[PDB]
Amino acid sequence: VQQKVEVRLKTGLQARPAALFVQEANRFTSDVFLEKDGKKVNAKSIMGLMSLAVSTGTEVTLIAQGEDEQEALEKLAAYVQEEV
Numbered sequence: 001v002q003q004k005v006e007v008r009l010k011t012g013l014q015a016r017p018a019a020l021f022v023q024e025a026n027r028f029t030s031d032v033f034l035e036k037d038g039k040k041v042n043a044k045s046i047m048g049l050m051s052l053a054v055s056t057g058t059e060v061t062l063i064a065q066g067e068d069e070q071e072a073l074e075k076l077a078a079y080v081q082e083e084v
Contacts, residue, residue, distance in 0.1 A: 002065025004033060004040070004073045007081040012056020013049045017079065022049045025076040030066015032076060037061075043076055053080065 011017045025032035026044035034043040036058040041047040052060050064072025
């Protein structure tokens with residue numbers, strides 16, 4: 001089941017946090033995504049990170065279409081815009 005919460009990627013998933021992002025979204029047994037204002041990709045995947053997630057400042061919706069749909073999507077999107 002897929003849900004996603006769009007957040008501004010203040011992380012812009014460069015590596016430090018975002019590797020952990022991918023890792024968490026990935027922990028989540030969900031087809032996770034990150035959709036830059038709709039431009040979605042597998043959040044836990046290369047293009048999810050490097051492509052969409054890496055777009056620091058984009059209001060990208062972090063999806064999780066898995067066992068931890070809601071869980072994954074919300075905390076992962078949260079993560080992008082929650083710290084620095």
